[PDB]
Amino acid sequence: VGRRALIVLAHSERTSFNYAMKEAAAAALKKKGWEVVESDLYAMNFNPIISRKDITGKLKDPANFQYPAESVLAYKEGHLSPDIVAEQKKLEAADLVIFQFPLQWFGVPAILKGWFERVFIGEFAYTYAAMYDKGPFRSKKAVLSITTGGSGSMYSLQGIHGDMNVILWPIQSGILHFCGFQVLEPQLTYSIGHTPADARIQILEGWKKRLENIWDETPLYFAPSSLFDLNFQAGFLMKKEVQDEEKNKKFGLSVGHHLGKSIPTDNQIKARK
Template identity: 60%
Template sequence: MLLEGKTALIVLAHQERTSFNYAMKEVTEKALKKKGWTVLVSDLYEMKFNPVLSRNDITGKAKEPSRFKYGAETLAAWKEGRLAKDIKEEQKKVDRADLIIFQFPLYWFGLPAIMKGWVERVLSMGFAYSFETMYSEGPFKNKKALLSFTTGGPGSMTTPSGLNGDINVILWPMQNGILNFCGFKVLEPQISYAVAHIPDEARVGILQSWEKRLEKIWDETPITFLPIQDFEGMTGGFLLKKEVEETRSDNRYGPTVGQHLGKPLPPDSQLKSENSRL
């Protein structure tokens, strides 16, 4: 089934066109276009995207130049159309996108610096979140997003007994703290393990599997996070409501990696949707 009218944004963070990450980007672009998608690309290294937050991220006069507060100033600038040109251009792409795919190598258990800077500058206060609109009520609650990344080591290293620790814990800050926080429906991550240490045919297999997945990517069930309605408001410290906690008291596992209630973490809750884990 073709999906004319749907738009995807690929945010790529790799400095080499000969890289596996670039190959993944190429496959993504080709496969989605074949299904009728419009595909936008932000190749951050090619763009020489500036990842550094500064006063230059706003134009015009600051509200409080003697005591510059980045969040407040960029919020005001966003409302008044005074954000820097490169930020506004990227925000237009985000606005257009139904699906955002972040393609990158996992560096130091997180996003590459240039991509982290894109997140910090582009997903600015007001545009991507506020205290009134965040998590399940975030501005992007009608959009989907996923992380597609490569690792240096094999998958066994990121298991609960592996040297690097549980991949679910590594994913939580990115998938919950960035994507879910802004309201995105988060799809299962696409993880390409140890691509520098596997034979060519294995890398080809990964690319083919990814291409196959992209055929029905829009129909996938998102990963489950607790809705913001399950928590008290600011006066209650944003804590999980007692009645919600009580309904889960007999569960063996905590509800999420973050709100685990002192129980074992739910297995693969950041890797697969509940339907996939059943």
């Protein structure tokens, strides 16, 4: 189990439900003896733009600045920006990380996107070797508590916006699982601007009760890295014997690995291997 959890909030108003949602988690987690710490991005006057201003030390090659290589170099020799180091110290310590935020243009707010780009540095957050399954944060679990303006129906299989499982994919698979995270089931709060005060106070309570047993929760299913040949040579594709063994299955392995077939229902919203 865990004892320390980091809550990254990305909203500008202390009067919003998101803020409320954050304070709910803080109170709850603390109750069950957790140890909370938070990253209210807007509160930290956080900078989301990656740039050489991220490396305090001497760049290895100013003529042609290659951010990935320079920042990864920075992480080793110790030349990273002071705000990035501190955030990297929150993560490293944290067992559970809750990303509290409002859906903005089918994705995460710009400020949180930059928080990833600047904190999730190579070596630290991921290794081209130990990707996904073997990533650095593998002993950690992460969750997305989102809020939307559009209602749930809009995001169903017949909804005009499309399948929400498709929207959460790049985030939960591409950013979170890539670094080794076990991603729990997303806490989805649809049309929070069309919710009666009464129903809203229940969401705060619905969210807190969940947090009492959040760690023993069954995580989301991701195709294990063992089903692929992990080398530039092999282009990182599914082992041949798997490509064949999978050909007899009705559904794909997940939203990203649908393999031209039917996508397993709520692969990004519901746990069940």
